[PDB]
Amino acid sequence: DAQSFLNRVCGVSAARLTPCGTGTSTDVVYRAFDIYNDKVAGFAKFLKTNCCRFQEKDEDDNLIDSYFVVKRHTFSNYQHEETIYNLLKDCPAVAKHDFFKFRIDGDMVPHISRQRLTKYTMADLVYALRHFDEGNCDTLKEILVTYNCCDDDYFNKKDWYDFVENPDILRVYANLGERVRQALLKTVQFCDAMRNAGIVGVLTLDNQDLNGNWYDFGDFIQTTPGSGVPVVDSYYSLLMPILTLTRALTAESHVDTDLTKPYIKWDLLKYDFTEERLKLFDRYFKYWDQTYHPNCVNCLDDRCILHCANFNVLFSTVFPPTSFGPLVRKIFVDGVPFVVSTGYHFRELGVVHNQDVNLHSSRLSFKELLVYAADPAMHAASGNLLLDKRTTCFSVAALTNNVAFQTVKPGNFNKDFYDFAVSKGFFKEGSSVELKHFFFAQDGNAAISDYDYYRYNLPTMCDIRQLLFVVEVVDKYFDCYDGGCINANQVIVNNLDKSAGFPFNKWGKARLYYDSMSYEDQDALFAYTKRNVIPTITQMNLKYAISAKNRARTVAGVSICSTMTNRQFHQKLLKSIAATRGATVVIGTSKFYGGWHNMLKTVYSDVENPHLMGWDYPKCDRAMPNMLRIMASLVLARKHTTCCSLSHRFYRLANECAQVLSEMVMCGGSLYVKPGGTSSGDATTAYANSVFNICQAVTANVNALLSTDGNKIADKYVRNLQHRLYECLYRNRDVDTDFVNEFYAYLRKHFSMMILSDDAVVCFNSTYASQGLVASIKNFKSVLYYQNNVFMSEAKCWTETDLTKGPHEFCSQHTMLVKQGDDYVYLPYPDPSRILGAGCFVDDIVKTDGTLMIERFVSLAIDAYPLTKHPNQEYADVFHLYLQYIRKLHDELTGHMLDMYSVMLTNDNTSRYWEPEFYEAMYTPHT
Amino acid sequence: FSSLPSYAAFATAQEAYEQAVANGDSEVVLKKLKKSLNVAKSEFDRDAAMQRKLEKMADQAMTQMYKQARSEDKRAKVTSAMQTMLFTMLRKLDNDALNNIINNARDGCVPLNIIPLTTAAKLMVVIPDYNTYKNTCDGTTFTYASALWEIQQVVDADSKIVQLSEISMDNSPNLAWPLIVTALRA
Amino acid sequence: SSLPSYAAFATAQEAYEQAVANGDSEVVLKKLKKSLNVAKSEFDRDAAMQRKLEKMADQAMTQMYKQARSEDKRAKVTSAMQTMLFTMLRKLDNDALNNIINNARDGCVPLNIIPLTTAAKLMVVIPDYNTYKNTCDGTTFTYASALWEIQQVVDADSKIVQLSEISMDNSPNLAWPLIVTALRA
Amino acid sequence: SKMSDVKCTSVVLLSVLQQLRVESSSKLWAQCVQLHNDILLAKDTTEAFEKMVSLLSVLLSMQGAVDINKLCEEM
RNA sequence: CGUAGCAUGCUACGUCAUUCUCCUAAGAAGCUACCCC
RNA sequence: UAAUAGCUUCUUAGGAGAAUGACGUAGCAUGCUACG
Ligand SMILES: Nc1ncnc2c1ncn2[C@@H]1O[C@H](COP(=O)(O)OP(=O)(O)O)[C@@H](O)[C@H]1O
Ligand SMILES: [Mg+2]
Ligand SMILES: [Zn+2]
Ligand SMILES: [Zn+2]
């Protein structure tokens, strides 16, 4: 009968139940298991068919979120789980079981009935937040609704899920905070209940209902009491991105950890929170067996800096934000008191102290003078307090007495070229080539409206058992090159007449500081940064250049004290990346002389069913997490295995994080604190961006390979690859270089890549991405959602199913297959509205004369030559327009020189710039 | 190079050759003097090449020593400028409250982010609209950073002084926002 | 190149051409060959420096031209830009731009940005009765190719004056310029 | 071909206004910048001309800046 | 027939002048990627 | 008014190579004078 069974499931507990499903039959539900056994492995959405489910209704016959799972299995498992439960009965964090044998048809089937679970479990929340798909997210909307995070109309908004268009979604996610945190606490109870009862078992995410209880004892072996061990390696690790997405540790800022009570008033002078970090770690992540040093200066290697830094990135969201930044100290120079920084307090790397503190100095050499002028200790200490309400970022001081509002003037108009263009039939109504790239102007509040975009950077706790394998795969990607510290005389500077940041720009360009410092005290500074931390002020400038849309473009000018040492540290690797051809990171490979065709042929590195793909990171340089930037700086500093020691590498990392990651930004006469994200003006910006891009691609591949079912995988080599990938991720702590090589070979075989710092072209296998054995666009959207805190809409990431058309867009240059000589080659052509926009609008009044600038239109015609092969005629006419304009320019130039003097130029070789052959030779593979 | 004796030898060889030609000298004498002229010319050309090389090297050395002198004359100038900047900011320090909080520290180290917050005597509040002005610093005294601040000046985005009576809800559109209000610690 | 060195080389070349035309043998012909060759070497030496000078006097024509023209271009930027702006504004041949431009010539300039939204305020000075008669018909005010409803007319002393007083007989008694405050209709 | 004439005449007009030191008056410069950026980012010709009128009335408002009578006399 | 000397023609090494080519360094100007669509 | 990369043009310096010519020393062929 279907009613006596329902009366038995209620048991002694007086509960009113409605049967989900029908007629004492199993209820089949699609859940989010974290499973690992002999055949299947991974964190994937399975379909469970062994649990009869009843829903409890309270008085007034309303349905509440409390279920009675009556999972049925064999008798041996029933008795084993009964004994394990009777060992763990007295624990508070164990769901109330009820073991009973019921006469189903002709035999006594033994059922175990868990009482007052929830509909979903912690794995469902973790999966729906880590594998987000805006088309199909019904286990996240239902979780948000049923726990009063939102009122079920919040989803009628156009973009509720977006982090950049709708920041209020964060306020929704934080409403799950105290529901996650209690769960963590329940684990620290349950682990103890195992430890004191001698039960060895694996704590999986799919066994904890969202209340916090634990209800699965199937795979628990009992040992002598008091000596058990709970394996929480794969429980806390998958939960880690949720502990900062939902801000599960906000209730630690309040006294007695109660959300109703007011905030804890920490001491303003308190900067050493080591004891508090250890207390938090020992309260929440108690059985996380790996050692945790709150200060990363005690870390064993570059894989323990990532682990402890990732932990501190969570534990630093409960501490006041005024206790971070530099740690100043009053020193004396020839009897006069300076206040200078003798360390730093990184949110990620903890407290770092300088080792060369010169108390009671006598003279200040140029190195010490440069150091004391660079750091913001004197600048912030001698400035007046600032309260800027235009931004949410912390504001330190105002150096001047008034705030400076900087504008961007409009660009000059080249009327001669525009009249010539409209004379040749351009710019008609309905023409396919139209002016779209203009010189936009900005008002006074632009410089501080753009810096406010750093509100998109949130403290993100990355999954640490997976990041420590993505690091290995990325380092395998970066194995071809070589690097190390170089002497001061080997440093090459491309352009010396550019500004040296703040405050050094008030006395000269970078040439002054590269000529005033001899090589001895230029190596002394670099050897100082290897044992000390130099905070640095970086200025924000507004760029004055042609653009498609009106939003301001700020660029960070970093001080010469930072660049002068970063070039020395990184330039060997930076010149080895920019001199290797045929690699994944295509930096330093020209698009001229048949270099684009070689790029596109090295992308197609013998993949089976090629489909091209490209993705765009929304707010790439402003929403990049601190952990991924530290990851990039550690992968880029792995080449220093012989030139410098471990402490030197750590202090170089601390200097990079103090001068790039979390710095003091001078934004219009005011020092603000940059929350994070890479600055676009340091030495290692494009290459660190490339490392981060490859990290995101490998993370998407790992997620796509794990989240596949495991029984649908027909290729028996890929199933074993998944089953070993899960082991090398969570069930393995040391590096397994054989499998790292195997997975890197798999990625090169099926996910061939081409990277320019965020411009990625992928030539993935279509069959595997269809089966899910390789990352697709939805996987990158999910990875960017749970790991970058941005939403990558599918309207800006493209996919090309035909290889005879090339990538749709790479480095803002479209690609087309054109016939040259007797063979077909790929030629890149720019946006044809960009060349006209550069011709018509110039950023200097002397660039409007025309006759003075014939070597300016030659370069534009060189960049716009491939348009001649384009099938559209209005595209092809842009090159002939520039050729005829160069001819007219030279004609009137010779006229003006024949007027100004009485003799023409004798040796004149401008007769080849209006010929198509000089530009056709620019895209020929000979040179 | 003309002062060298090689030029004199070349000139006297040419003069002897010309005198022999004008005097109707024999073939042997003419050819011998021509060969003497040749050996003088080769040595004079070598001397000229040596002089050109020496002069180009001396001029390059002068350029090198007139560039290093400028480098060492700018190094001292930027050093003096940096020392002046580091000492003016020192003379701007409030050595009463800063000294008190630093001596109050356990190890002497205090975070930089709280050096102004407890010692700065001047506060510059930048306000984008009237609602923020009403919320944070309405009136002539407001409380920020656990201290009482008194308004001393209000300027607009145009760096024009604005009287505190002009900042009203109806007069808000006629003001050039943002407003920078400068207050002093009390 | 027809320089005196080339003249000597040319007469030597003519002598050697005559010798070749004879061209029997042998020692006098070799002597003519050596004399022609040394003359050619002297001419080439004294013409290479002339070519160098001709090349170096083309890096002082271009450098002077793209400096005089540069300073001329960046000196007249305040007036050339305005002349270009008004040339383009004549070229557009719009009805509203030409209307406000032709009104600004007579002195009928607006005292604020002309608003776009309906029932928004525009304060425009009208400095004479002649310009008032064309723009203002009844209570309607034609400006920027749009019709506006007059709210308040205030003379130069800021004293309000009703539209009944503004007439040809009583116009000279008013204190011009009037300021009309209209709302877009 | 008169749509793309407005997108350039507004550029020249904002250059003129910037040379007339309207950059110092922040309230007026914000409106001029917004009008310029809305003229450039305009697909419809009527909207571009309507904003061009408002951008030009900033130039015509200042009496002593330009000499409109002389500049238009060259026609 | 040999030796010494002189003269003429032909090869090898060195100096200088001219022309051309290639590279390595330095300097100056410009364009693009960058930023946004 | 930033980092890196690529490309175009011009200038200077240095090196290398090739060619032509002038000249100076070594080797080969031929003719003349003196001696054996
Ligand atoms: N084919 C099967 N049929 C019924 N029960 C099974 C089967 N395979 C495994 N089980 C039992 O189910 C457990 C895994 O299911 P799980 O997802 O943990 O459910 P729950 O979380 O409700 O315990 C194992 O401990 C095992 O005893
Ligand atoms: Mg389970
Ligand atoms: Zn560590
Ligand atoms: Zn090193």
Residue numbers in the entry:
A (entry chain A): 3 to 929
B (entry chain B): 6 to 191
C (entry chain D): 7 to 191
D (entry chain C): 1 to 75
Passage from the reporting paper:
The SARS-CoV-2 genome is replicated and transcribed by its RNA-dependent RNA polymerase holoenzyme [holo-RdRp, subunit composition nsp7/nsp82/nsp12 (3, 4)] in a replication–transcription complex (RTC), which is the target for antivirals such as remdesivir (Rdv). The nsp13 helicase translocates on single-stranded nucleic acid in the 5′→3′ direction. Translocation of each enzyme opposes each other, and if the helicase prevails it is expected to push the RdRp backward on the t-RNA. This reversible backward sliding, termed backtracking, is a well-studied feature of the cellular DNA-dependent RNA polymerases (DdRps). Our results establish that the SARS-CoV-2 RTC backtracks, that backtracking is facilitated by the nsp13 helicase, and that the resulting single-stranded 3′ segment of the p-RNA extrudes out the RdRp NTP entry tunnel in a manner analogous to the evolutionarily unrelated cellular DdRps.
The sample comprised two major classes: nsp131-BTC5 (3.4-Å nominal resolution) and nsp132-BTC5 (3.6 Å). To eliminate structural heterogeneity in the nsp13 subunits and obtain a higher-resolution view of the BTC, the particles from both classes were combined and locally refined inside a mask applied around the holo-RdRp and RNA (excluding the nsp13 subunits), leading to the BTC5(local) combined map (3.2 Å). The cryo-EM maps also resolved a single-stranded p-RNA 3′ segment of the BTC5 scaffold extruding into the RdRp NTP entry tunnel, confirming the formation of a BTC. By contrast, the BTC structures were translocated by one base pair compared to the RTCs; the base pair corresponding to the A–U Watson–Crick base pair at the 3′ end of the p-RNA (located in the −1 site of the RTCs) was in the −2 position of the BTCs. The −1 position of the BTC was occupied by the first C–A mismatch; the p-RNA −1C made a non-Watson–Crick hydrogen bond with the opposing t-RNA A. The next three mismatched p-RNA nucleotides (+1C, +2C, and +3C) trailed into the NTP entry tunnel. The 3′ nucleotide of the BTC5 scaffold p-RNA (+4C) was solvent-exposed at the outward-facing end of the NTP entry tunnel and lacked density and was therefore not modeled. The trajectory of the backtracked nucleotides at positions +1/+2 was sharply bent due to spatial constraints of motif F residues. The RdRp NTP entry tunnel provides a steric and electrostatic environment conducive to channeling the backtracked RNA out of the active site without specific polar protein–RNA interactions that could hinder the RNA movement. Our RdRp BTC structures suggest that in the absence of a Mg2+ ion D760 presents an electrostatic barrier to the phosphate backbone of the backtracked RNA, explaining the requirement for the helicase to surmount this barrier and why removal of D760 stabilizes binding to the BTC scaffolds.
